Amino acid sequence: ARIAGINIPDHKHAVIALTSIYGVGKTRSKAILAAAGIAEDVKISELSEGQIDTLRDEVAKFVVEGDLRREISMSIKRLMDLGCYRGLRHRRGLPVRGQRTKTNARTRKGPRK
RNA sequence: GGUUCUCCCCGAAAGCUAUUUAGGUAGCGCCUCGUGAAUUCAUCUCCGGGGGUAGAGCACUGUUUCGGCAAGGGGGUCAUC
């Protein structure tokens, strides 16, 4: 299938296109392939009649899609409700990694203006 | 501006329209003289009408207050935005 989340890309290797499965990435790809006992030399283009099962099965074992994107974003407000550092820093846009906001932090403040 | 004898009858208008017209003039309206015509015309009563003014009203068009108060809120305090 195209499974959970619309589209699975094709005209490229199986592992690759599996990285484009909104919560599956570099490792996590070849880890499903290893599981499902199948190659990456073959593309997804070929979509095996075996691999077709394991698509939904192994992405069903991982927190992915809406499920993950829920939980994370539920927790950005969780701390926010409790007067946490991690909390308020999200509504100023600020980091939590001790980064340079004397100079940098132009992914947290947006770019130079 | 002035415009000269007499008697008798009826008797206006200062409105409208147009005008290089607005103190002019023309037509009409209104007067007069004559000739036709009509229970024509006029009034009044009775009978039938359409009316949007006066008055009144506040649905509508706007406008005004005052209670409540569906919604908005300016405004303050607080948070996470």
Residues 49-108 on chain A lying near strand B, CB distance under 7 A = 76-77, 80-81, 83, 87-88, 90-91
Nucleotides of B under 7 A from a protein CB: 80-81
Q: Looking only at Cα atoms, what is the longest distance across chain A? A: 56
Radius of gyration of chain A, Cα coordinates, nearest whole angstrom: 19
Question: Resolution in angstroms for this experimental structure?
Answer: 5.8
Q: Is A95 helix (H, G, I), strand (E, B) or coil?
A: coil
Q: Is A82 helix (H, G, I), strand (E, B) or coil?
A: helix
Rounded to the nearest angstrom, the gap between the alpha carbon of residue A91 and the centroid of all alpha carbons in its chain is: 23
Residues whose CB falls within 8 Å of the CB of residue A79, separated by 6 or more in sequence, listed in order: A86, A87
Rounded Cα distance, A108 and A101, in Å: 9
